[PDB]
């Protein structure tokens, strides 16, 4: 009778040294009970995660599996502990099996990409098009300069199709795709679509959750 959860949060010391802030994780398009979030972790950050606020699941729970693909260095005995300071893409997959959930936690490298007509029409992960990564909690990811004109497209890289984890700028805010998108973001609304030309760059700040074309 159980279905996969609709919400995921993360909580811990890289957000609030008091564990009082719960980051709601963005949901992976078209795939149920999978979530992703771009977070800076300090060295020996401690965190847990949960489905609702004030649920605390940690590394020792037998429903839980960790997969490190970022060299974050994940360990701990209750809390999750991330050894190496860095931006990482925190990624959770909750699947039903039996009457309980079964979590897969994956750290992906902080890899953000420009796609689409703004790039001369790359529709695949291509390292010419990867944002540089800021050193601090508060820096920006910045794209390389665009080489053509059109709608801007942006995504993170995972083991899934790119467009399942892509996003844009609505009103200075970072908006993660949550509908069926075919030709353009204007399918959502305008000032969801974001018009670029040769020379432009994006700045993203994922701590704030904002960004801007420049
Ligand atoms: O500020 C105090 C506290 O701050 C930080 O703790 C974090 C913690 O690391 C996070 O995991 C989270 O805690 C969650 C738990 O994850 C969650 O399971 C639940 O915890 C309940 C326990 O399962 C239950 O056994 C009992 O906890 C007891 C605990 O066994 C005792 O040890 C005692 O806790 C004290 C710590 O021992 C002490 O080191 C310090 O904790 C710091 C911690 O170092 C830091 O990382 O103080 C605490 C108590 O103040 O007492 C508790 C019961 O009081 O009951 C808890 C339910 O509370 O819930 C907690 C969140 O409350 O978040 C905390 C920060 O809040």
For the CA of 20, the closest atom of ligand 1 is 66
CATH fold of 1-110 reads Immunoglobulin-like (2.60.40)
What backbone torsions phi and psi does residue 118 show, to the nearest 5 degrees? -65, -15
**Which burial class, exposed, middle or buried, applies to 133 when counting CB atoms under 10 A from its CB (0-12, 13-18, 19+)?**
middle
Q: What is the resolution of this structure in A?
A: 2.5
> What residue spans in the chain does CATH classification 2.60.40.3610 cover?
111-214
Structure method: X-ray
Edge-to-edge strand list for the sheet holding 45-50 = 22-24, 9-12, 45-50, 80-82, 74-75
By alpha-carbon position, which residue is closest to atom 12 of ligand 1? 19
- How far is the centre of ligand 1, averaged over its atoms, from the C-alpha of 46 (Å)? 12
47's tokens: 């965190």
In the chain, list all ranges with CATH 2.60.40.3620: 1-110
Contact status, residue 191 vs residue 41, Cβ threshold 8 Å:
no
The CATH number given to 111-214 is: 2.60.40.3610
User: How far is Cα 76 from Cα 79, in angstroms, rounded to an integer?
Assistant: 6
Question: What is the rounded distance in angstroms from the CA atom of residue 3 to the CA atom of residue 18?
Answer: 32
Q: What does the chain look like in DSSP terms, one character per residue?
A: -----S--EEEETTT-TTS--EEEPEEPTTSTTEEEEEEEE-TTEEEEEESSTT--B-TT-TTEEEEESS---EE-SSSEEE-S-EEEEEEEEEEEETTEEEEEEEEEE--EEEEBGGGTSB-S--GGGBPB--SSTT--EEPPPP-S-EE-EEEE--SS-GGGGEEEEETTEEEE--S--SS-GGGT-SSSS-EE-TT--EEEETTTTEEEE-
53 CA distance to ligand 1 centroid (A)?
Answer: 16
């Amino acid at each position: 009778s159980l279905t996969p959860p609709k919400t995921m949060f993360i909580v811990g010391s890289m957000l609030d040294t008091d564990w009082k802030v719960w980051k709601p994780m963005a949901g992976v398009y078209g795939m149920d009970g999978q979530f992703y979030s771009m977070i800076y972790f300090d060295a020996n950050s401690e965190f847990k995660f949960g489905t609702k606020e004030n649920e605390y699941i940690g590394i020792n729970d037998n429903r839980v599996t960790v997969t490190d693909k970022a060299g974050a260095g994940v360990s701990g005995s209750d809390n999750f502990v991330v050894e190496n300071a860095g931006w990482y893409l925190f990624y959770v997959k909750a699947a039903v099996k039996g009457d309980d959930y079964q979590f897969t936690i994956t750290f992906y490298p902080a890899e953000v990409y420009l796609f689409g007509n703004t790039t001369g029409g790359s529709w695949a992960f291509n390292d010419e098009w990867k944002f540089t990564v800021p050193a601090t909690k508060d820096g920006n990811f910045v794209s390389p300069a665009m080489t053509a004109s059109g709608e801007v497209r942006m995504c993170f890289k995972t083991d899934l199709d790119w467009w399942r984890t892509e996003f844009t700028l609505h009103d200075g805010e970072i908006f993660y795709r949550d509908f069926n998108l075919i030709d353009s973001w204007t399918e959502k609304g305008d000032g969801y679509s974001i018009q670029g030309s040769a020379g432009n760059v994006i700045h993203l700040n994922f701590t704030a959750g904002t960004g801007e074309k420049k």
